[PDB]
Amino acid sequence: SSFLHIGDICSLYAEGSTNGFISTLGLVDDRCVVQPEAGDLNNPPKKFRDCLFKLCPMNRYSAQKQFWKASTTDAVLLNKLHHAADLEKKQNETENRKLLGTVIQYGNVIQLLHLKSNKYLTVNKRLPALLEKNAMRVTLDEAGNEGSWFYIQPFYKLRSIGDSVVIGDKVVLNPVNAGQPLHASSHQLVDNGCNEVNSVNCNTSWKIVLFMKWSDNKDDILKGGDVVRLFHAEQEKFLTCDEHRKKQHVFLRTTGRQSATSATSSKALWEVEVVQHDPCRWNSLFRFKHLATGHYLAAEVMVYSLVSVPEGNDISSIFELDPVPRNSYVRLRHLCTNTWVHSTNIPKEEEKPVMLKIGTSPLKEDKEAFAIVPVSPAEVRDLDFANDASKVLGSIAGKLEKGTITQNERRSVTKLLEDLVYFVTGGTNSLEVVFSKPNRERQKLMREQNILKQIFKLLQAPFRHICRLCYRVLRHSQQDYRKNQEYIAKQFGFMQKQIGYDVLAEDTITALLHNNRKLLEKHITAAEIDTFVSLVRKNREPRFLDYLSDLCVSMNKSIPVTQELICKAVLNPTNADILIETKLVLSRFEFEGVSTGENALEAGEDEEEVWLFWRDSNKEIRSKSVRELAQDAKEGQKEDRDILSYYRYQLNLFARMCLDRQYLAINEISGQLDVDLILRCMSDENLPYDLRASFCRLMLHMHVDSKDEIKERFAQTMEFVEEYLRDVVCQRFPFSDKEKNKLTFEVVNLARNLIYFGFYNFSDLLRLTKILLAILDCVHVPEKEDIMVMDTKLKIIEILQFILNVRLDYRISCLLCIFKREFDESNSQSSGALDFEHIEEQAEGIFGGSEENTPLDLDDHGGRTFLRVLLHLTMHDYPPLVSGALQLLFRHFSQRQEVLQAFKQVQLLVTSQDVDNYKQIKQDLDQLRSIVEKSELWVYVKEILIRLSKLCVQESASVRKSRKQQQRLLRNMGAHAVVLELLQIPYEKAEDTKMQEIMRLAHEFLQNFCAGNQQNQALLHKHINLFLNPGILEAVTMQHIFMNNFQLCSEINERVVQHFVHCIETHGRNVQYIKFLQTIVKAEGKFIKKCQDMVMAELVNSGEDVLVFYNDRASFQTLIQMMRSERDRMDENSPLMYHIHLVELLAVCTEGKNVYTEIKCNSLLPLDDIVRVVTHEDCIPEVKIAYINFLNHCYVDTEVEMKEIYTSNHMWKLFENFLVDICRACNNTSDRKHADSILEKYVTEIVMSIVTTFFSSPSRDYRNIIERLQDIVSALEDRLRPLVQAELSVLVDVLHRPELLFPENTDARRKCESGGFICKLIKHTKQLLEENEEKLCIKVLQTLREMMTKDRGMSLAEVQCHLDKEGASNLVIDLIMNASSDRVFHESILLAIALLEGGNTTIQHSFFCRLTEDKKSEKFFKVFYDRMKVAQQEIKATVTVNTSDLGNKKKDDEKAKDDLEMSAVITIMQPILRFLQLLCENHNRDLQNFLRCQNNKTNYNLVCETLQFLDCICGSTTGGLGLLGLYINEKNVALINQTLESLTEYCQGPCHENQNCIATHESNGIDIITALILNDINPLGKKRMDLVLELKNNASKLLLAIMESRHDSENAERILYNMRPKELVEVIKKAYMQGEVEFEDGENGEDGAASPRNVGHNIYILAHQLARHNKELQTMLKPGGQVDGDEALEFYAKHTAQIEIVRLDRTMEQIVFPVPSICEF
Ligand SMILES: O=P(O)(O)O[C@@H]1[C@H](O)[C@H](O)[C@@H](OP(=O)(O)O)[C@H](OP(=O)(O)O)[C@H]1O
C-alpha cells in the first residue's frame, strides 16, 4: 500500500488520554507540547506549519560530543576535536541524503526533525521534566544528540518490528537510550491550553499523519508552503502589504536604492498555498498568505483591486499562474473573477509617496509579470525568531508595566536580552566579549518588526542587566548604521539620563561620539556640565570621566570643554602633588618608573587622563596655546612632549600648502618623477595592505640617490628623530615599537607636520630630507599579527604620508626656475603680467585667510574688497594660486549676518575657468545642499542663496559629465522637495526673482531638447503643484513653473511624458491661457507685459519638449480638433522681440503643430494664419525668422498632398519659399557668415534631400610675452622629445620578473620572477576607489608597450604570459568599471588590452575558458557593452550623420571656403563614437571558435544592436546612397570596415542561425548593405578609391560568410534588395568595366585587388548563390553562357574567375557541402 520514507514530511497526532498534534511555543522558548483544542484530525489546526516533522535517518554523534568538552588547555587539540565534530556533522549529511526516500521499518532508529524550528526533538535523559516531576525533559536542540534517536516501533500489534511503517500507523517512538518513551502529558502550562510533552512510560500512541512526501525537490519547485516575494517585472517593484491610514492595503513599494532587488523588506514576503484537498503537499491554483500579519490576498472592489482579507478560505483569495519552477516570473490571474492583475500609478497624504495601489484586469497584459523570487529559509527563521521577541516583550513589558513580574520571567527575559545581542551581531558579541561587528539585515528587522518599539516600551516606567544592558544592545544597533543612528542620538533624550544610570552607559555616548555625531551635542548643552561636575566628582580615576574625554571629537567640542576648565579650575585640587618643578616630578616618574603597585599603580590614571583630553584640542590653541606654555619634552614620554609642540605649533604659522606656481611646467616634471610617484602613491593611497606599500619600499631602498623661536623646540626634534633611527638600528620593533612607534607616530605627523610648518627655501630644510632618506630606509623602512600590523600600518599612512609629503610636492621645486638660463637672445641664468602683485595681493589674501571678526579694528577697513583685482582678472588665465584662491574660499562656509560678505565674496563669483574650478567646487557639495537648503529656506545676509545660486550655474554651464555629476539622489528630490517645500508657495514678482534660476540652472539638459533629464519623473513625481483658477498668483515662479515642468517630463522614451504634458494641466490648460493672465502680470510687475508674453511662450511650448514623447501611443488623438482650433485664438501678437523668441518659440511651438499628424485633421485656414504672420514681422534680421520662416517653408513644402488637403492653394507659399530661398546678403547687406560652401551646401544636399521627399507625399608685457614664447618653443621641443624615452623606461618595468631576479637576486627561494600577475591581482583590487585616474591610465600605457617589446623594439607568450600569470581573467573582471571611471580612458583601456591578446586568440580562449565558468556571474554582465554601443548607437548616428548629410558643396565644379576647421569637431563628435569603434576592432581580433561566437546564454544577448548601429548610419539610404557627405564623411569608413571584419569573423563561422538572424533583426541594415555597392561611390577620388576597396572587399568577405551554407530562407532577403542580376552585372560590368578598363594598377598587390577580386567577389558571390532555386538560375544564365562582349568579359571572369568549388569532407560532424576558393588565373 503506502508507506513512510526518510524525507517524507508529516505531522504526529497523539491519542493517549490527551489527543493533539505536537508543537512549539516559538523560537525563543524551547519546550514541546500538544495544544489539544487547537486542532484535531477532521478540523485541522490553524497554524499547522508548526506541527510538521521530517523523517530523518540516524545522526552520527561521536566527534561532536567530544568536541563538546570545551577540560582542555591545549589549543591544537580542541581544533582537532572540533574539526572532527565538523566532519561528522557533515558525514551525517552525506549519508542521510542517501537514506532519503527509504521506507522506515519499525524499530529502525529515526530522528524526527522540527521544520519550522529546524530543531531536533530530544530527550534529555539526566533531568526532570518541568511540569511533570518524574518524566525526563523533552526539548528541541538545534544540532541534535544521541537523545534525538527514536525507535519507530509499533504500538498495536497490527504490524511488527521489521515490517515497514505505513502512513497513518500508530507507533511508540521510544528514545534509543534516553529512556522512557514519548508521552503527551495531562498537565497544561502556566502561561498558555497546551500540554508539555515528556519522556515517561505511558500509554500514549502516535498517529502518523503524512504532510508532504519526500518528493519535494527544493529549491527547484515552488511547492505549497514555499516563501517567495512577487517582484514586478516592469514596475521593478516588489509587491508589499502594509497599513496606511490604519488600513491594511497592499502596494508595490518605491525604493531609494540603486538596485530594486535589494529593497528587501520583511514586510514584503508571502507563503505559498498550493491548494490541496486534504491539507497535504503547476496546474492547480495557489493562494498567498501574507507572511507578516497572517492574512491572505484578494482582489475585491478596474473591476477589482488587490487588498487584504482576514481568513484564507473564501474563493476570492484564489489565484492561478501563467508562464512550476522556482524563481519563475509568472503572470497571475484571479480565479473567482478571471482578471489578470494590473498595476496603476495612483498612490496619499504623504509628499513623494511609495505604496503604489494594485488592481487586476480582464485583459492579459504582457509586461505585468512577477518574478516568483524564492527566499532563504534561514531568513525565514530570522523573522520567526524575531516575532518571538516582539511578543515576549509583548507580555513582559505589558506585565512589568501595570504591576510586577514574577521571578520566573526575569530569568527568561534577561536571557533573551542576552540572546539578542547574540543574533544581531550575526553571532559575534554576547560575558567577556572579543569583537562586535554588526549585521545589517537583522538591525533592519529590529526596526520593521517593532522589536525596538517594545524595548523602549519596556524600559519605560534590579536594572543592572536590563538597562544599560539594553543601552548596550542599542549601542550596538546604531553602529555605523546611519539610518539607525538617526535614533541613538535622539533615542537618547532618555539615554543621556540613562547614560547616567550606567557606568555601563558611557559606552552609549562614546559609540555615539565615534560614529554618531552632530546631533548629540545639541540636547546636552550645559547638561554636560552636571554630568561632568557629577562625573568629575564621581569618576575619580575619572575613568568614566575619561571615556567622557576620548568622547571628545570634532571642532564644535572645544567650548563646553573650556567652560569645564573653569569648573575644572574649580575642580583643581587633587590633594596630591605634581611638582619639582624639574625635580620632584622627575622623581614621581622614577617612582612610577619602578613597576610598583598601589602608588605606581595609581599614577597611570593621570597620564592617560592628560594625553587624551589635551589632544582633544584640535587646531585650537591660544586658550590652548595659552593652555600650553613651557614647551618641555625631555622625558617626552608618549608624545605628550609631542602633542605639546603640537599645540605650540597650532600657536605658529598655519601651513597653507603653499603651492606657489602653475602652467605646463608642472606636468613635464611629474613625468620625470616616474613610477616611484605611483610607487609611493599606491603603497599609501592604496597598499592599505602593508605588503604592497612594502614593495614600493623595495622601491625606496633602491632609490638610494617664528622661524627662530620655533626652531629651538625643533632642535630637540631632529635629535629625537635621529634617535628614532638608531632604535631603527634596532630591527626588532617588537612591542618596543608600540611605544617607540606610538611616539614616533605623533612625532612624524608632527615631524612631517614639522617639516611642513618650518621648511625654508634653501638647500637646508632639503638636506634635512637627505637625513630623511636615511630615516625612511633605516625606518626599516596571521592571527594576532593583524592587530599588531595596525601599527606598522599607521606607520605607513604617515611614513608615506610623510614619505609622500616631502617626496611629493616638496620633491623638486628648484630645478623649475633654476634652469633659468637664456634662450635665442642673450644669457639669463637664474644666477600673466604682474603675477606677484595679485599673488601678494593674494598673499594679502592668505593674510586674509588668517583673520577673524572680533579685531573690530582691522575687520572691515584695511582688507576691504580686494575682489576688484579679482573682478579685474577674472578674465585672466587662472593663476596657480586659485586652489589657494579657494583657500580664501573655504572659510566663509561658517555664516553671513554682516552684509559686506557679497563684495569680497563676489570676487569669487568672478571666474573664467568654470569647468576646472567647478569640479573642485563640488567639494561643499554636502555643505552646499545645505546652502541651497538654507539659501533656499530664505529665497525664491542675502549672499548664500545668490552665491549658492552662482555656484549652481557655474556648475550648470558645464560638462555633460558635469550634468551627470549632479547625481542628486543625495539630494535633489530634497533640494527640489525642500527647495519647493518653501519656494512653491513663494514666488517673486518681476523683475527681481530667484526661484527659477537655482532651480533652472539645474535642468540644462544639453541646452535642449527633451533628453537627459530621466531623473525628473521621481523628483517631479513627488511634489506639490503650482496654483490655478479663481483669483491669481505671484509672478515669476509660475513661468518658472511651466518650462521647468517641460524639462522634468520631456523624456522622449517613456509614455509617462504624454500623460505628463497632459497629467495636471492637460488640454484644459489652453482655456485659462485665453484671458486673466495679463491681469495677473499687470498686477505682477511694473512690466506686466513681460510676465504675460513669457506666459504666451509657456502656453505655446507644450509641443517642444519630448514632442516625439508627447504624441506617442495616443496623445494627439485626445486633443484632436480642439487645440488647433484653440490656437487660431492666440494667432495675433506684436512687440515680440521677446515674444518673437515666442514666435521663434512660437516658431518652434508653432513648428510643433503639423509633424506627427498623419490622420487627425478636419479643419482649415491654419496655413493662411501662419503665412500672414511671417509677412507681418518686423525688427531683427530674417536669417532667424527666415530660418524659423524658412524652416517653415521646407517643413511645409515637403508633404505635398496632406497640406493641399489643408487648404485650397499654397500659391503665396512658393513666391515666399522662393523669396526666402532666393534672398540677398542678409537680406540687403549684413555680410556676417564665411562657411558658404558649407551653407549653400548643407542647403543643397538638404535640397537634394528635400527633392526626394516630395514623391512620398500624402616694458613688462614683453617679459610676460617672451616668457610665453620660450615656453612654447621649449615646450614643443622638450615635451615632444622626452616622452618616448619615458615610454621605453616604462617598458623597463615589463622585464618585470627577471627584474626581481637581477639585483634583488632573491635567495632561499624568494619570489623575484612573476612580479606581474600579483602586482596585478593587486591593482584589480585597487580600483575599489571611485577615482583611479592617470594611475590606471599609466598602466594602460605600460600594456600597449607590452605590445612594444615585440613591436616598439616571443610576443604571444607575453600576451599569453600575463595570460599565464594572471591573465585575461583579471582585465575582463575589470573593464566593467569603465562606466564611471575610465569612461575617458576605458577607450584607452580597451585599445591596450586588445593589442597584447590578438592573433594569439589561443591565450584568449584561455581567457574565455576561464570566463564562461562564471555562467551566472557571467551572464548578467552581458547586456552591457551592448548598451554602450546601442546607447552609443541610436543617438550617436543622429548627432553628426544628419548635419553632415547636408554635405558640401552640393554646387557644381569647374574661395573654396570649405567651412573652416571641420576636422577637429568631427574628432570630438567621434570621440564617444571612437570609443564604440575601437570596440569594434577588439571584437574582431579575439573571434575564433563557435561557442565563443555563440554569445553564451547571456541575459540580454542580441547581436541585433550592431545591425541597428550599422543600420543606424545606414538608416535612410534604401537607394544609391544620398547621405553622401555622411557617406562621403571620413571617420565613418574606418569604424565600418572594422565592423565588417568583426561582423565578418562572426558570420565567418557561417552559422546557419547566424547568417539567418542578422538581416532579419536588422531587416534593413542588410538591404542597405546591398544598396550601397550598386551605387558604390558617386564621390570618386582618394576618398572614393577607399570607398570601393572597402565597399567590395569587406562586402565580399562578409557576404561570403553569411552565404557559405544551404537552406533557402537566408538567401532571399538580400536578393530582393538588389535589382541583383542587373545591379550586380552592370555593377560587375561598371565595377568590372570601370575597374577592368584601366589596368594600370599595381601588380602582385598583396594589398588591394578591388574592382576585380571584388568585382570578382561579385562573380564569386553570384557563383555561390546557384545551389538551389529558380530565380538564381535566372541571374545565373549570364556568366552561365553568352557570347556578348560583356558576357565575355564576364566570361573573362567565370574562367578568369575560378567559377568552381572546392571539395569538402565536412567539418564538425560530417555536414555542409561546399564553398569556392579563389584560383582564377
Ligand atoms: O546610502 P546609505 O547610507 O547606505 O543608505 C541607504 C539608502 O538610503 C537606500 O536608498 C535605502 O534603500 P530604500 O531606498 O529602498 O529605502 C537604504 O535602506 P535599507 O537599509 O532600509 O535598505 C539605506 O540604508
From Swiss-Prot:
Lipidation (S-palmitoyl cysteine): 51, 730
Binding site for Ca(2+) 2: 1481, 1545
Free-text description of this protein's post-translational modifications in UniProt: Polyubiquitinated. Polyubiquitination targets ITPR1 for proteasomal degradation. Approximately 40% of the ITPR1-associated ubiquitin is monoubiquitin, and polyubiquitins are both 'Lys-48'- and 'Lys-63'-linked.
UniProt keyword list: Apoptosis, ATP-binding, Calcium, Calcium channel, Calcium transport, Cytoplasm, Cytoplasmic vesicle, Disulfide bond, Endoplasmic reticulum, Ion channel, Ion transport, Isopeptide bond, Ligand-gated ion channel, Lipoprotein, Membrane, Metal-binding, Nucleotide-binding, Palmitate, Phosphoprotein, Receptor, Repeat, Transmembrane, Transmembrane helix, Transport, Ubl conjugation, Zinc
Membrane protein topology class: Multi-pass membrane protein
Gene Ontology BP, a term: release of sequestered calcium ion into cytosol
Domain MIR intervals: 101-155, 162-211, 219-275, 324-375
Cytoplasmic-side positions: 1-1721
Effect noted on mutating residue 157 to A: Reduces calcium flux by about 50%
Any one GO CC term of the record: transport vesicle membrane
Cross-link (Glycyl lysine isopeptide (Lys-Gly) (interchain with G-Cter in ubiquitin)): 784, 1449-1451, 1622
Binding residues for Ca(2+) 1: 661, 933, 936
The reaction(s) this protein catalyses: Ca(2+)(in) = Ca(2+)(out)
Activity regulation behaviour: Inositol 1,4,5-trisphosphate-gated calcium channel activity is regulated by cytosolic calcium in a biphasic manner, with low concentrations causing activation and higher concentrations inhibiting channel opening, giving rise to calcium oscillations. ATP increases the open probability of ITPR1 by synergizing with the activating effect of these two primarily ligands, inositol 1,4,5-trisphosphate and calcium. Inositol 1,4,5-trisphosphate-gated calcium channel activity is activated by zinc ions.
Residues that coordinate or bind 1D-myo-inositol 1,4,5-trisphosphate: 253, 255-257, 444, 447, 481-482
Subcellular localization(s) per the UniProt record: Endoplasmic reticulum membrane; Cytoplasmic vesicle, Secretory vesicle membrane; Cytoplasm, Perinuclear region
One MF annotation (Gene Ontology) recorded for this entry: phosphatidylinositol binding
Domain of life: Eukaryota
Quaternary structure and partners: Homodimer. Homotetramer. Interacts with ERP44 in a pH-, redox state- and calcium-dependent manner which results in the inhibition the calcium channel activity. The strength of this interaction inversely correlates with calcium concentration. Part of cGMP kinase signaling complex at least composed of ACTA2/alpha-actin, CNN1/calponin H1, PLN/phospholamban, PRKG1 and ITPR1. Interacts with IRAG1. Interacts with CABP1 (via N-terminus). Interacts with TESPA1.
Family: Belongs to the InsP3 receptor family.
Entry note about domains: The ITPR1 structure has a large solenoid CY assembly built around the central helical bundle made of the C-terminal domains from four ITPR1 subunits. The solenoid scaffold includes domains responsible for binding of ligands and regulatory proteins and is connected via an allosteric nexus at the cytosolic-membrane interface to the transmembrane channel assembly. Six transmembrane helices from each subunit form the central ion-conduction pore.
The protein's role, per its UniProt record: Inositol 1,4,5-trisphosphate-gated calcium channel that, upon inositol 1,4,5-trisphosphate binding, mediates calcium release from the endoplasmic reticulum (ER) and participates in calcium oscillations. Undergoes conformational changes upon ligand binding, suggesting structural flexibility that allows the channel to switch from a closed state, capable of interacting with its ligands such as inositol 1,4,5-trisphosphate and Ca(2+), to an open state, capable of transferring calcium ions across the ER membrane.
Listed name of the protein: Inositol 1,4,5-trisphosphate-gated calcium channel ITPR1
Species the sequence originates in: Mus musculus
Name of the gene: Itpr1
Part of the intact protein present: 6 to 2217 of 2749
